[PDB]
Every structure is written in C-alpha cells, then in structure tokens.
Amino acid sequence: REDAELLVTVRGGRLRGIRLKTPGGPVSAFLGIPFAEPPMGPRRFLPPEPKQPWSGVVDATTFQSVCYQYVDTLYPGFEGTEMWNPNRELSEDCLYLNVWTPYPRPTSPTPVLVWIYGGGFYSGASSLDVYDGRFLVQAERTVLVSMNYRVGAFGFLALPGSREAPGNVGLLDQRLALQWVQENVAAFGGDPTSVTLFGESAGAASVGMHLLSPPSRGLFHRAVLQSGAPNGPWATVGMGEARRRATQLAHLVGCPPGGNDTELVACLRTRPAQVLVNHEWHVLPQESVFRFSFVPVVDGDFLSDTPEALINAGDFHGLQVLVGVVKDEGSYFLVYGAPGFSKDNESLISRAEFLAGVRVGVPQVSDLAAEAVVLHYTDWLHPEDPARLREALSDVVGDHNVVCPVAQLAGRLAAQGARVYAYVFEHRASTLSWPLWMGVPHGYEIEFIFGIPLDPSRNYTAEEKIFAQRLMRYWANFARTGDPNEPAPQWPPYTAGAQQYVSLDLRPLEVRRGLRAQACAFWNRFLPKLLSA
Amino acid sequence: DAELLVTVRGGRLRGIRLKTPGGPVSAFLGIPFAEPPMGPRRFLPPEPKQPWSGVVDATTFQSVCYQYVDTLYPGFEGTEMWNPNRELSEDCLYLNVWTPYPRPTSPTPVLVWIYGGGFYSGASSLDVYDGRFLVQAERTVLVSMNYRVGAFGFLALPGSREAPGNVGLLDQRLALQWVQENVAAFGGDPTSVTLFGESAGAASVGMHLLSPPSRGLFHRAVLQSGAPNGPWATVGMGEARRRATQLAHLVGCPNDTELVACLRTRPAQVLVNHEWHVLPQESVFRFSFVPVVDGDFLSDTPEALINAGDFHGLQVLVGVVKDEGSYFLVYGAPGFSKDNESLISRAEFLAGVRVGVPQVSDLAAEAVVLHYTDWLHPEDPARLREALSDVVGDHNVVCPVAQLAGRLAAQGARVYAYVFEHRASTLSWPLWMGVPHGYEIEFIFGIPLDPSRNYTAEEKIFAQRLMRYWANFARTGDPNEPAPQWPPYTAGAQQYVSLDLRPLEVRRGLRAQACAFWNRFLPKLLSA
Ligand SMILES: *[C@@H]1O[C@H](CO[C@@H]2O[C@@H](C)[C@@H](O)[C@@H](O)[C@@H]2O)[C@@H](O[C@@H]2O[C@H](CO)[C@@H](O)[C@H](O)[C@H]2NC(C)=O)[C@H](O)[C@H]1NC(C)=O
Ligand SMILES: *[C@@H]1O[C@H](CO[C@@H]2O[C@@H](C)[C@@H](O)[C@@H](O)[C@@H]2O)[C@@H](O[C@@H]2O[C@H](CO)[C@@H](O)[C@H](O)[C@H]2NC(C)=O)[C@H](O)[C@H]1NC(C)=O
Ligand SMILES: NC(=O)c1cc[n+](COC[n+]2ccc(/C=N/O)cc2/C=N/O)cc1
Ligand SMILES: NC(=O)c1cc[n+](COC[n+]2ccc(/C=N/O)cc2/C=N\O)cc1
Ligand SMILES: *[C@@H]1O[C@H](CO)[C@@H](O)[C@H](O)[C@H]1NC(C)=O
Ligand SMILES: *[C@@H]1O[C@H](CO)[C@@H](O)[C@H](O)[C@H]1NC(C)=O
Secondary structure, three states, rough: OOHHHEEEEOOOOEEOOOOEEEEOOOOEEEEEEEOOOOOOOHHHHOOEOOOOOOOOOEEOOOOOOEEEOOOOOOOOOOOOOOOOOOOOOOOOOOEEEEEEEEEOOOOEEEEEEEEEEOOOOOOOOOOHHHHHHHHHHHHHHOOOEEEOOOHHHHHHOOOOOOOOOOOOHHHHHHHHHHHHHHHHHHHHEEEEEEEEEEEHHHHHHHHHHHHHOHHHHHOOOEEEEOOOOOOOOOOOOEEEHHHHHHHHHHHHOOOOOOOOOHHHHHHHHHOHHHHHHHHHHHHOOOOOOOOOOOOEEEEEOOOOOOOHHHHHOOOOOOOOOEEEEEOOOHHHHHHOOOOOOOOOOOOOOHHHHHHHHEEEEOOOOOHHHHHHOOOOHHHHOOOOOOHHHHHHHHHHHHEEEEEHHHHHHHHHHHHOEEEEEEEEOOOOOOOOOOHHHHHHOOOHHHHHHOHHOOOOOOOOHHHHHHHHHHHHHHHHHHHHHOOOOOOOOOOOOEEOOOOOEEEEOOOOOOOOOOOOOOHHHHHHHHHHHHHOO | OOOEEEEEEEEEEOOHHHHHHHOOEEHHHHHEOOOOOHHHHOOOOOOOOOOOEEEEEEOOOOEEEOOOOOOOOOOHHEEEEEOOOEEOOOOOOOEEEEEEEOOOOOOEEEEEEEEEOOOOOOOOHHHHHHOHHHHHHHHHHHEEEOHHHHHHHOOOOOOOOOOOOOOHHHHHHHHHHHHHHHHHHHHHEEEEEEEEEEEEEHHHHHHHHHHHHOOOOOOOOEEEEEOOOOOOOOOOOOHHHHHHHEEEEEHOOOOOHHHHHHHOOOHHHHHHHHHHHHOOOOOOOOOOOOOOOOOOOHHHHHHHHHHHHOOOOEEEEEEEOOOHHHHHHHHOOOOOOOOOOOOHHHHHHHHHHHOOOOOOOOOHHHHHHHHOOOOOOOHHHHHHHHHHHHHHHHHHHHHEEEEEEHHHHOOEEEEEEEEEEOOOOOOOOOHHHHHOOOOOHHHOOOHHHOOOOOHHHHHHHHHHHHHHHHHEEEEEOOOOOOOOOOOEOOOOOOOOEEEEOOEEEEEEEEOOHHHHHHHHHHHHHHHH
C-alpha cells in the first residue's frame, strides 16, 4: 500500500516523497514542495505570497521547473558551462523547495542545512546535479533544504517606491522559504532551533544579506559564505541605478508605448518572459565582467542601509560564520569579455590587453582609480611578461569581486563578536573540463562540499572521495556545533589580527595568514578614499 | 720650487706640496675666482675676479661661506665632519686645484667636485673632500669650489634684479668657466672635464646638464645620491617669493628694491638664524632657499627638461647608498634618535609620514601608508622604523635618481648605476642606520688610505677599487677596467651593481615597485 516514511503533513497539507538510493544507504527526498503561489501574470515582480492550503496529497517526487533565466551559449555543449545551465524546463511557476532527510526519519531533532544557490542573481537552480543533497544527508545525517528563488528581472527588477515592482522579491522568496523551514522542518525530523544557511557566490551574498536583515536574522543561527559576500561591488545597486536599468529594459521592449510606474509595470507584465531575458543585459552601463543587471537594491527596507554600513555597525555576538574562497576566483570570468582570453588557448595577453582588461574588470571607475589598480598589480621588473599579466588580471577580478569583500566581512565580523572560520579551497578536480591556466575556478569547490565524488556514475579518484567526505564532515560539524573541528590538525578561528585560515586540498590542514592582505588593503582601505575625493 | 708657482689669467699663485702614502701631490688652495659678494653685491650674480699684482698665497683653504652649523649632537663625529672647519665669511668664492707632483706636462683629465649640504651648508675644505689621494692614485687634476649657500646663494625675488635667484648656481658655473680658461696651466685637460657631486651637489650637477650655458663647460657627470628632479632640489617662483618675504619680516625689514636693500644691511649671521622658520611646515629633507625655476637658468622644471632632452653623447654615473633616509629621521621624525634603537609605534610612523612627505593632501599620505605598510605585520616597530626610512629615502633620493637614470638612458645617454652597501668600520652612527646618506664619499676620495685613520686593509683595497671606477669613467666614460663587468643601466633591464667588499654583483631594479608609486602614480593623484 504505502510507505509511512514518505508521507508527511505540513501546514499546507499532505506530501508524498521518494526513497532515494545513495552509495551509503537510503535517503528520504521531498522534491518540488510548493511554498508560494506561482508568481505569474499579475503576480510578476510582486513579493511572494504564501502557498494556500491544499486537499489531498501533493507528490513531491521530483525537481520542479527552473525559474526563467538566461542560458549560457558561449561554449555550446561544453561540460564546464552546461553544468550550471537549467536542467529542467524554464517557467515563472518556479517557487518550490526540496527537503532531504535520513531514512528512516530521525526521531530526535536534527540540525538543518539550507542551501542557497548562486549565479549572479540572474541564473541558478536547486535542481542542478552539483547541488544533489543525498550524499550530505546520508554521510552526516543532517536535514538539507534547498529552494528556488526568482532571478534576473523577475526577481530583482526594481522601481523603488512603487508597490508594483518594489525590488528584492527574489530575496523575499528566500525569506519565505526560511519561514517555511521554521514552521515545517520539524515534521521531517529537522531542528528549527539549529538552522545553518550556506550558499555560494550570489547565494553567499544572499546569506549575508539575511544576516543583515532583522526579519531574516531570526530564521537561522549560523551562516556559511562560499566565494561571495553582500558587500561586493556586484551584489547590490543603488535605487537610482536600479530605476535606470528597469526603465531602460522597459524601453527596450516597448514600455511605455518611464513616466508612471503602475502603467509601466503593467506593460512589462504583458511581455513574454523570454523577451525580458533577451534584453536584460543591454541595460548595463558599460561592457564588463562580474557585473549583473538586476541585483538586490539598497532601498531602506530589506537593507536598511548599504551592506558595508550594516556590517560596520552590526553586533554579531552569538553568531558563528564560515567563509572562504577558491584559489582562482577571477579566471572563469575573464573568458566572458576580457580581451585576449579564451578557454581554448592559454590566454597569454599583451600589456595593452591587460590595461584594456583592467577597465573591463573594474568597470565604472575614474581613470585615476584604474591607474591605482595598474600600479598595484603590475610587476615593474617584468611589466609586459604575458604570463604574469594573465595571472594579474585574474587576481584583479578575483580580489576586487570576491576575496577582499569576503576578507573585509570576515574581519569586521570577528572584531565585533562573531566566531569566524576561514578557508581557501586549493584542490583542482581531476575531472575539471576547464583549461589548466584557470587553476581552481569560481564555484568548483561545491561538488566536493555536496559529496558528488561519491556518485558511482562519476570518475573521481579514491583520494578525491576521501577529500569530499572530510569536507562534508567540516561543514556538518559547523552546522551542529558552530565549530568545524572534530570533538587531528586543528582549524583555528579567524581574527582581524592574526588573520588565520586553512588550506583545503588533498593534503592535511595547513594554517596560513592573511587573505591577500596587501591587495585587500588597497581595495578595502585606500580605493574607497580615492573614490570619495 | 718652480712646481708650486703657477700663473693664471688673473695673476701669479704659490701652492704647497702635500704628502700621501703613495707620494707627493701639488695643491693650490684658496684661489679667488670671483669678486667678494659682500655689501651691495649680496644676492647678486658673481663677478669675475679682477687681475691682481704680486703672488696670491694658495697654500691653505679659504673661509667657508656663511651657513648654519648643526648643534643636535655637539662634539659627535658623525655630524662634526660636515660642519665648517674654517671661519665663516661672505668673502668665500675660492676654488682649489690638486695636481700630481711634479705638475703634469701632458693634458690630464679633470674632476670637478661640487659639495652637497641641502643648498644651505657645505664647504670644499672638509677633510672628507681631500683630493690628494685621488690625484696621486689615479693621476687626475681635481678641482673643487666654494659656492654661496642658504639665502646668500638662493634667496629669490623673481623678476627683480637685486635678488634674481640661483646665484649660488652661477658661482659654480663661474668656477667651471675658470677651469676652461686656466686648468691647462696646472696640466689639466679642459676638453675632458667630469663633474661629480653628492646630494645637493649631485642636484647641482644635474642642473648644469639641463642648462645650455653650463652644458658646454664639461663633458661627463657623476650624480651621487641626488638629482635635480628631487622634490627638495627646486622651488617655484611663488613659493620662493613667499619664503624670501617672510625672511625679511623675521629680521625686521619691510617693493623688491626697498626689501633687498634692508636685507643687505643685516649681518650675515642674522639671516642664517632665521632661514629655517620660513619653511611652510615641520619636515625633514626640506630646505628653505634652493634653486628656483624662473625660466632663466632653468627654462622649465628639471623633470620637464629631462623628458624633452636629447642625451645622445652623454655618459653619467649615478648611484645611492643602502639607507638614504635613515640619517634624516633624527632631525624631526617623532620617536627617532641616534642614541636608541628608534623602535617607533604605529602612531609615530603615521605622524612621521606627514613629516617625511610634507605638503601633500591627506589622500596622498594615505597612499604612502598603504604602500609602505606590511598588512601582515602592521604594527611591528622594527618594520615601521625600516619603512619610514624607506619613505624618506625613496621619495627624496632613490626614486628621483631612478627616474633620471631611466629617462637619460632611454633618450641616448649611457648610464651606469650603483648602490653603495658597505658600512665603514669607523662609522659612528648607530647600527640601525645602515649605510647613511653621504658615507660613500670618504671611500671615493680614498680617505681610508690615510694611515692616521683606522680603516681595515680590505677597506683600503676597496677605496682603491672605487677610485679606479670613478677615474676610469672620467677618462673614458666607462668605469670598467679595459672582473665581472659593470653593465650600463637601461629602462628595461634596469641593471645596477652593488658596491661593497665583495666583487661586483649585478642586480635589477632600483626599488622598481616603490619608485613606480612615486614617479608614476603620485603625480597623477596630486594633480587630480
Ligand atoms: C586566444 O583566444 C582569443 C579568443 O578568440 C577566440 O577563441 C580562439 C580559441 C579562436 O577560436 C578564435 O578564433 C576566437 O575568436 C583570441 O582573441 C581573438 O582574436 C581574434 C583574431 O585576432 C579577434 O577577432 C577576436 O576579437 C579576439 N577576441 C578577444 C576576446 O580578444 C586570441 O588572439 C587568442 N590568442 C592566440 C591565438 O594566441
Ligand atoms: C628614543 O629617543 C627618543 C628621543 O630621544 C630622546 O630624547 C631625550 C628624552 C633623551 O633623554 C633620550 O631619552 C633620547 O635621546 C624618544 O622619544 C622621546 O620620548 C620622550 C618621552 O620619553 C618625549 O618627550 C619626546 O617627545 C620623544 N622625542 C621625539 C623626538 O619624539 C624615544 O622614546 C626613545 N625610545 C625608547 C625610549 O624606546
Ligand atoms: N540575460 C542575458 O542576456 C545575460 C545574462 C548573463 N550574462 C552573463 O553570462 C555570461 N557569464 C559570465 C560569467 C559567468 C561566470 N560564472 O561563474 C557565467 C556566465 C554564464 N552564465 O550562464 C550574459 C547575458
Ligand atoms: N638656519 C637654520 O636654522 C637651519 C638650517 C638647516 N637645518 C637643517 O638641519 C636639519 N638637518 C641637519 C642635518 C642634515 C644632514 N643631512 O645629511 C639634514 C637636516 C635636514 N632636515 O631637517 C636646520 C636649521
Ligand atoms: C567516466 O569515464 C568512463 C570512461 O569510459 C565513462 O564510461 C563514464 O561515462 C564517465 N563518467 C562521467 C560522469 O563522465
Ligand atoms: C682611531 O682613529 C681616531 C681618528 O679617526 C683616533 O683618534 C684614534 O686614536 C684611533 N684609535 C681608536 C682605538 O679609536
């Protein structure tokens, strides 16, 4: 007849899941649980409203649709890019979440891990194979939750002040899912008093904004920010620039036939989703990399102030945070606009291409600011060495967009009462499809965190599987106790003075100092002073 | 002794025979080359010395031009060696000639020394400028002149004829013209004149390179720890007028004519006593009365003239010591002294940056702090003491010299660069100062050869090797012995040699990272 372990009642009604096969053992999975009414038609650009109760049993037996988003076409059929592309049908009916739990269901409350995918706030899906939660759940016996949230214009087009397009609705999607976790995760055996948020890139930036937003802060207890921070120059936008991009997007699709917000939004709602996707990138002020059209907006509501101001003025006592980056944060983004770069050659650029790439990698700054960047990243004993220039531009984009925003956040949190653990992921996967000059690119620690190497269908080495099991143990130890160390080389906390972090690779843990302290002093201390003058 | 009797165009001279460990040399000290710039001739360009009857006694050094005397460490050898060793006087325009004994009968290459001292001090009579060892060992003619310093040499009311400015530079040029007309009477070759100078003397050498009326009076140049494009070497017309105007107010004097007239009534010591209170702020390596850019001696700023110049056919020898700035820190940087380790704090370091980099915006100062802070050890006292010494040294000497060398080389000049890294065993300064500013001169003049001093046997050999380098360059434009070789400095390779007891070691980059900051970025920041 029926299996009781796959039947759960939540506030909205009854659910039916599936028993998932993993190499280590069975897993209960509830995939495609609706947590909000479909944000379609008149509900486009609007905040999510809760899913109204249902009669009967909802089959939560497979991943639901991917929120409508752009699909990468630079390298068609290439494994390195297709792994991030939608693996389900695109639709605006996309607000569903997923719950993995041990089989049989835990009888005592179990710590919960909530995943927020990244993708520059314009892409991503909880259904990607690299976000498969069955291995983490089986190996460490946690409850893992992941949700879909609206991306691109559908999630972050903002006409600030208007009620028809208030902005930040993609973040409200995440917040609603976190509220769903608080009310319902105990029915799956999860502990709502021990909820750990973790995400990568825009997901990590999202995690940080929930830390800084009081209505979200009460919904979790710990945070993990991988290769992303809310104080990044790409993660937020001002109210005026948000309105300019929304108005230009509407102008590019025939709305109005700016002016009035109500008529302008209503005209945008009549446009097919693909039409908005096709023009969303034409609203960027200049050609750039690591810049996204529609991102969270600082409008005094979700973010009372800029993330940097909230970070500096925040009291973080009672909070544990795990932060980190990969070894080569910037390499991936260079083949998407930096002159002379491609994955199919070694991208040994000239001095002129380096100087031109600086303006692409650091867009919308004065020529004096660009000169400061050139001065700091040029080796004046080898000013035109093609190799050194290629690595330097990669460091420019990586430090400016990831490493130094993360370091600044970690330093301010530790100084203001939070316990911080920092890492640098340095293992290049044996199966990595990207060229070797890219090193360890953005986002390629995720598959090890989720235990993907234990998939028998894939071809990781036996040592990479032990590495994956060790990383899953770190993450789950942090979720359980706020400490990645086991109750063995120790992982010391990160503090603003010593600035200690660990290397994550096949070798045992190695303690180092300084997350590129010299470079990050330029980005976090001096260059803001230069932009003010 | 006919070897000590010489007739120049002005009249007859009587010299003196000196002794060296390698034999005797002929010396002619206190030769007048200008009319005494006293009374109504104060602040005025030098007049050629009128011919005289009888025999001028040229057997001892003449008076030192009126200048400030350091009193921070009274009786301390490290400072007394630079203080005047003859009486002070405005009657001070005399030069000295050293020749081999007996006098050369064939044209001999000529070395012309221009002393340093921030354009406010210095004298050709100092013991460390004794030319007898160079002349004996390398058989050259050596000339050194006294030139007016301080307000007497560089007070300027631009546009006026009573204080035109740069008259101390014109003193040097007049001595160079004197060499062209009279050095052959001593056996010297006026067609082979090499200028060499240290600190403000090196800056003066550079300015003679950039001034056409002086450019034809010599053929080669040596710039030691100084450059004409230094932030201290020149001053604008507006600031020169302000500094001169405040000096008159400080000494009780009121129109340029009425103002210079009142300054000319003041005793020389009075102007000396107030010369440093006209500086705009508390600082180090900043001097009140320096050459002014007024379109005459310098038709443009030295850095502009450097960039626009064709320097083909020119050979220069440039260099620095290992620790250019450490010396200046004990004259105003908070927390520094020669009598303790000077392990300063972060707060003193930040305060010392404003003293070491005076008269720049807060943003420019923050850029300095960023580049010279180790953000892994931001408060380490030993690293901060080292860093502030590099700030003063790079900004004032190393990077101005690196800029001049790179531009000259890339524009036709053959450049040889060095770093002097030997600390003298007799050095009285504390060990944390390393090799301070000016402490390569005694080795180039071969002072270690003096048996009355306590240099080592290897230091004597080292001094002989340095005199050979300098004299080779004076003779051929190439310091190399016709080892390993001393390669030329180029804008790309940036090759220089280290000078110490070890054989020559070739290295790349004169603090290339720090000098890109000072020479490339900071000018853009201050103008934006
Ligand atoms: C390295 O690759 C870049 C990118 O070029 C693309 O990828 C290459 C692998 C090859 O397939 C090219 O044909 C592709 O266009 C090269 O830069 C491009 O050069 C071409 C020709 O000069 C020019 O038309 C493009 O605009 C350039 N693109 C960019 C982004 O600069 C680069 O020259 C290659 N380096 C080599 C071959 O040494
Ligand atoms: C190293 O010395 C400096 C200054 O030299 C001292 O000056 C006299 C006080 C003398 O008696 C000797 O100590 C030294 O020659 C010290 O900095 C001074 O500190 C005093 C207080 O002790 C203060 O009043 C002065 O302003 C400071 N001077 C300057 C130029 O800033 C410094 O403390 C000494 N370093 C130590 C003791 O570690
Ligand atoms: N809506 C659009 O037309 C659009 C959206 C986003 N991009 C940027 O996409 C290129 N890009 C640039 C950089 C990355 C880096 N990822 O780590 C990934 C990708 C591709 N993602 O699908 C271009 C156009
Ligand atoms: N006339 C004055 O009062 C006067 C003149 C010159 N100084 C210079 O004295 C300080 N000083 C003394 C000696 C040196 C020696 N440097 O090698 C350098 C410096 C430089 N900057 O402060 C001070 C006062
Ligand atoms: C692993 O490699 C083998 C080699 O033939 C192949 O059969 C298999 O499909 C590969 N797996 C993946 C996930 O690429
Ligand atoms: C060293 O030389 C000095 C003169 O420079 C002399 O006074 C002294 O007697 C010598 N010996 C010692 C031990 O200092």
